[PDB]
């Protein structure tokens, strides 16, 4: 029943509310498709529904499971980062923090003059996948 | 005790309302199958496709474009549902309406690219009737494709829209437009 909310903002990302909840969340860096099976269902959201539907209350509940997943029965193995290295906390990285730590992990290896490092630096592919035919555009 | 019905549909009183198209539109003049599914060895002889019910032809022909290929079990339910929609839009027997839909679309002439020594002019050639029924069935299926593809609209709905649009020839239909162009080229060439 009813209308509204279309274009809802969760941590520093614009979310098109016109897409069914899980699928909408893919505009959030960190919150693609497959955790809406974790997050919404354990947050007790009615799952046949829109992201443009459902109370701010449910939005807050969803945010807490995302950032604190271990405490809601979410296995360690279902978290983006097991065993970080640094602080070695089981963490699901959200939003812009994903981007920042992505840079930080490149930078660890760039400093040292690592293989991984230097293939980030010049770019190309740090997973050594064949650029004989492909890597281009 | 013998005889009777397609899916629940009366085979009897289904008139092919066009001589020449009688018998190459092989409805079920004795052939009361029940299902549009058949083991269907129609390919060995040239004239053995003349035998196979037009409903069965429609099922065979729906499932082309490679992902979709050879799912005859997909095909038969869609033609059965297209029947049922056809019965609701115009009212009567949906077998009669399929037969009428194939009739309207059937192409008068055509052109072949005879080599003519620098500037290749075409020579115009009349159509054989063992291509009229098949090409009708095929372009009703292409019209059903095109409308249903990016549309919300179900294949069964777009088949039934295409078929009824053909049956009382509102023209409109993709089938008629493409064919009429081939005929116009045939009218010129001579």
């Amino acid at each position: 029943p009813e209308k509204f909310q279309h274009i809802l903002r969760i941590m520093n990302t614009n979310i098109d509310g016109k897409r069914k909840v899980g699928i909408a969340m893919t505009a959030i860096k960190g919150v693609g498709r497959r955790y809406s099976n974790i997050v919404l269902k354990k947050a007790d959201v009615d799952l046949t529904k829109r992201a443009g539907e459902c109370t701010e209350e449910e939005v807050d509940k969803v945010v807490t499971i995302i950032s604190n997943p271990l405490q809601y029965k979410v296995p360690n193995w279902f978290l983006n980062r097991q065993k970080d290295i640094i602080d070695g906390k089981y963490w699901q990285l959200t939003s812009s923090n994903l981007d920042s730590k992505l840079r930080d992990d490149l930078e660890r290896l760039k400093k040292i003059r690592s293989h991984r490092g230097l293939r980030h630096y010049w770019g190309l592919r740090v997973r050594g996948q064949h650029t004989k035919t492909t890597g281009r555009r | 005790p013998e005889i009777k019905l397609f899916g629940r549909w009366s085979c009897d009183d289904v008139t092919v309302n066009d001589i020449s198209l009688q018998d190459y539109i092989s409805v079920k003049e004795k052939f009361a199958r029940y299902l549009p599914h058949s083991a269907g060895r129609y390919a060995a002889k040239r004239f053995r496709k003349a035998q196979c019910p037009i409903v069965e032809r429609l099922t065979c022909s729906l499932m082309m474009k490679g992902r979709n290929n050879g799912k005859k079990l997909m095909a038969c339910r869609i033609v059965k549902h297209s029947f049922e929609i056809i019965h609701l839009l115009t009212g009567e027997n949906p077998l009669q309406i399929l037969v009428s839909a194939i009739i309207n679309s059937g192409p008068r002439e055509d052109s072949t690219r005879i080599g003519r020594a620098g500037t290749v002019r075409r020579q115009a050639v009349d159509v054989s009737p063992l291509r009229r029924v098949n090409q009708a069935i095929w372009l009703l299926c292409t019209g059903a494709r095109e409308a249903a593809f990016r549309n919300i609209k179900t294949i069964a709905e777009c088949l039934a829209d295409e078929l009824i649009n053909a049956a009382k020839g509102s023209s409109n239909s993709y089938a008629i437009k493409k064919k009429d162009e081939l005929e116009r080229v045939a009218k010129s060439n001579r």
């Binding site: - | 013998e2 004795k30 052939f31 199958r33 058949s38 083991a39 079990l73």
Partner: protein, 74 residues
């Protein structure tokens, strides 16, 4: 036992239709046989006929039995 969803189930239709005719050989009559045979052969769907059409052997230079790969150019 065997083959597939349509293949098996198609084969049951043959099995029953053929079977009934046999009962009439030994016990009832050809009267019952012939009337049945006429009905079966006429509308057909190979009900009395053991289908020969079986999987042609796949051919060297093809993943498919006549269907070759490649691009010889010309």
């Amino acid at each position: 036992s065997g083959g597939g969803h349509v293949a098996q189930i198609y084969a049951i239709r043959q099995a029953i239709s053929k079977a009934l005719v046999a009962f009439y050989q030994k016990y009832v009559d050809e009267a019952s046989k012939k009337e049945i045979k006429d009905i079966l052969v006429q509308y057909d769907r190979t009900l009395l006929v053991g289908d020969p059409r079986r999987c042609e052997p796949k051919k060297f230079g093809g993943p498919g039995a006549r269907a070759r790969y490649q691009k010889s150019y010309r």
